[PDB]
């Protein structure tokens, strides 16, 4: 609008949604955990944690994720990073089968316990997808889900603004975004590890 780097956003919606000027805004509450936590207990402790999905080292998104070289240099399949404190609290040991879930869905994977992960957050590196080394879910009774099985789209009104100079449409130039880091999930160690494939090669994680 001004032809210069715009610090002030004067569009009606920008003003009314409180962003005419930059201001601090805390992570939003997706309310995806409190309605399902403890509803389908498997006997193990459950805990809510921030679910971050930074991009992985053993693939570019899901490409190369099934590549044996990447699977061999990584942890052989879908895994989730947990702080030592959180894992110990939940009785989870390194490489234990765990299940992460909320109102949106559930996923299964193995834990990577590490000191470099701060307490309160979990990281399932972006995309390890749904075709390799995933057992059945104790929550859904279906094949375990993926990292996006626990997320859901929530648009922001300020990203719908159009017909206003710099705030006008363009393919890939403006529009609602698929934000996802504010998500929280319930985490717990798995008990029954059923593969749902008729091989009769299932396991049970004790206690």
């Amino acid at each position: 609008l001004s032809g210069r780097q715009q610090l002030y956003q004067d569009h009606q919606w920008m003003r009314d949604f409180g962003e005419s000027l930059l201001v601090y805004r805390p992570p939003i509450d997706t309310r995806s955990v409190k309605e399902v936590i403890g509803q389908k207990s498997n006997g193990n402790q459950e805990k809510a944690l921030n679910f971050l999905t930074p991009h992985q080292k053993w693939g570019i998104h899901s490409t190369y994720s099934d590549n044996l070289l990447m699977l061999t240099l990584g942890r052989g399949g879908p895994v989730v990073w947990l702080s030592e404190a959180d894992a110990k609290d939940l009785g989870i040991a390194d490489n234990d089968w765990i299940e992460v879930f909320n109102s949106n869905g559930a996923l299964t994977a193995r834990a990577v316990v590490s000191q470099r992960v701060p307490a309160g957050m979990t990281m399932m590196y972006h995309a390890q997808e749904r075709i390799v080394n995933l057992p059945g879910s104790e929550i859904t009774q279906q094949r375990g889900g993926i990292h996006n099985s626990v997320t859901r789209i929530t648009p922001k009104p300020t990203h719908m603004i159009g017909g206003y100079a710099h705030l006008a449409y363009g393919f890939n130039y403006y529009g609602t975004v698929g934000s996802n880091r504010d998500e929280f999930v319930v985490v717990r160690k798995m008990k029954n590890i059923d593969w749902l494939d008729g091989e009769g090669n299932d396991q049970v994680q004790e206690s």
């Binding site: 070289l69 240099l73 590490s114």
Partner: protein
């Protein structure tokens, strides 16, 4: 005095990004065969950690390297000749497949062939490449500890934490991690060569590359224990051992090794080092292990010294090799700038793949800190990686040479910042570490800009010397099976003749 040459390698751990590209390219080219699928000639490890194979640095457990007896004589830690032969029916120290990891694959085809009406979404489960059986779970891999993967108490079993109060490092604010890529060291006093009963392992005279003769190896599997770096891997299928071959097929024509040219972080340097082979035993048997580093530097010879040059020519070193030695980035980093250090010199093998230690973020403190000798940039004393850990890894526990390397790197940074930001000449930091402006500028040229021609200065191995390159050029590669390759005597039971040789002798002299 017997001069020999070798293309040494230096890895700048300060620029290491722990990406493993080096490992994947080597694997694709050299070890994708059944039998060595679990073997990574080049492998990268995140420290603190126990590595691949697990706890390979624990020589009390694995018995690798050499020991210096009370009489001053060298003996493989594995035992002398008789002791070693007495262990041949079952090597008691041999690492098992589980010390590496059980190689696996996945049933991808189940995704394609799953029958109609499946009760659940089909999936690809793991299967062992050793037994072909279903694996209930993958519990180990060659890079299992990547980026501090595992509880600190487990990772901290790291041999290099010896003599260090490591409790403080289990605290979040004091967390640290580094990358250690490694391959065979192609040692001057290799423990592998010394521990092979068949004498199938040898160091090539012309370029110092150490190889396991695939014809002559008998599969005694003692060498695996002998190597303190555990860089020899048994091929469980062929029944013979294999190891990094320093990409000799490429080096032979002057090309960088695959892991060197494909190093994304641009941290690997290749350059010739001329050494006095006659001094190898004297150096490796020095009484104090903290003297091994300097004793080895003393075996390296000055390539610009006419005395060395003339001796080199007399000893058969090609002119192009001597020339390459005179512009060797490895010689500059190890001998001139003292930035590169050997990996575990205490094993007494006189390793030829060296490392520049890594810098790190400043340690946790009470406040934001104050300007130090280097201004806004770090002072060596503030780095978070404990210098004693690095000394255990590179200098037999002596922190002096590690501190010098790190301080010099930081000094170069201070000097360059004054130059590029303040537009002023400030040699205060350089003077403190004994560096001249010229040295700092050359260090910068090689370490920062690092042009391709400066990272790799590999001369030809001159395959034409003492051989017959003409008939070879004309007939090599026609692998019809003449059955005459590999022997000097011409007689052969199948009454054949070499395809790449001349049988009709000239009668005109």
């Amino acid at each position: 005095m017997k001069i020999r040459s070798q293309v040494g390698m230096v890895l700048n751990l300060d620029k290491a990004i722990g990406c493993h590209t080096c490992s994947v390219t080597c694997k694709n080219v050299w070890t994708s065969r059944e039998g060595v699928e679990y073997a990574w000639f080049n492998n990268v490890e995140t420290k603190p950690g126990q590595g691949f194979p697990t706890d390979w640095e624990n020589q009390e457990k694995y018995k690798g390297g050499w020991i210096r007896k009370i009489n001053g004589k060298l003996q493989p830690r594995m035992g002398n000749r008789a002791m070693l032969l007495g262990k041949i029916f079952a090597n008691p120290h041999l690492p098992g497949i589980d010390d590496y990891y059980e190689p696996f694959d996945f049933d991808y085809q189940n995704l394609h062939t799953a029958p109609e009406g499946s009760k659940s979404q089909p999936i690809a489960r793991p299967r062992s490449l050793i037994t072909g059986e279903r694996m209930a779970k993958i519990e180990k891999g060659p890079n299992w500890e990547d980026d501090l993967g595992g509880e600190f108490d487990k990772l901290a079993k790291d041999k290099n934490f010896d003599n260090i109060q490591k409790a403080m490092y289990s605290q979040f604010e004091n967390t640290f991690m580094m990358y250690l890529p490694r391959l065979c060291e192609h040692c001057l006093n290799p423990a592998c060569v010394a521990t092979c009963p068949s004498g199938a392992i040898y160091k090539r005279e012309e370029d110092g590359i150490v190889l396991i003769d695939q014809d002559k190896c008998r599969g005694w599997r003692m060498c695996i224990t002998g190597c303190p770096y555990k860089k020899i891997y048994f091929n469980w299928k062929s029944g013979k051992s294999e190891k990094c071959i320093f990409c000799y097929p490429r080096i032979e024509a002057g090309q960088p090794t695959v892991c060197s040219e494909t190093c994304v972080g641009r941290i690997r340097y290749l350059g010739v080092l001329l050494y006095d082979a006659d001094a190898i035993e004297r150096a490796a048997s020095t009484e104090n292990e903290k003297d091994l580093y300097q004793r080895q530097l003393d075996v390296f010879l000055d390539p610009n010294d006419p005395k060395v040059i003339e001796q080199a020519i007399k000893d058969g070193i090609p002119l192009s090799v001597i020339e390459a030695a005179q512009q060797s980035p490895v010689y500059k980093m190890a001998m001139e700038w003292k930035l590169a250090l050997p990996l575990h010199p205490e094993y007494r093998t006189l390793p030829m793949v060296w490392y520049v230690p890594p810098l790190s973020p400043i340690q946790s403190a009470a406040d934001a800190g104050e300007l130090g000798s280097n201004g806004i940039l770090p002072d060596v004393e503030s780095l978070r990686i404990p210098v004693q850990y690095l000394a255990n890894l590179l200098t037999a526990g002596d922190t002096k040479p590690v501190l010098r390397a790190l301080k010099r790197m930081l000094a170069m940074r201070h000097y360059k910042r004054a130059e590029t930001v303040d537009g002023k000449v400030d040699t205060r930091a350089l003077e403190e570490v004994g560096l001249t402006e010229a040295q700092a500028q050359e260090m910068y040229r090689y370490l920062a800009i690092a042009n391709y021609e400066d990272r790799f200065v590999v001369p030809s191995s001159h395959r034409e010397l003492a051989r017959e390159a003409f008939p070879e050029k004309n007939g090599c590669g026609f692998t019809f099976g003449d059955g005459c390759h590999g022997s000097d005597t011409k007689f052969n039971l199948f009454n054949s003749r070499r395809i790449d040789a001349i049988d009709v002798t000239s009668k005109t002299e």
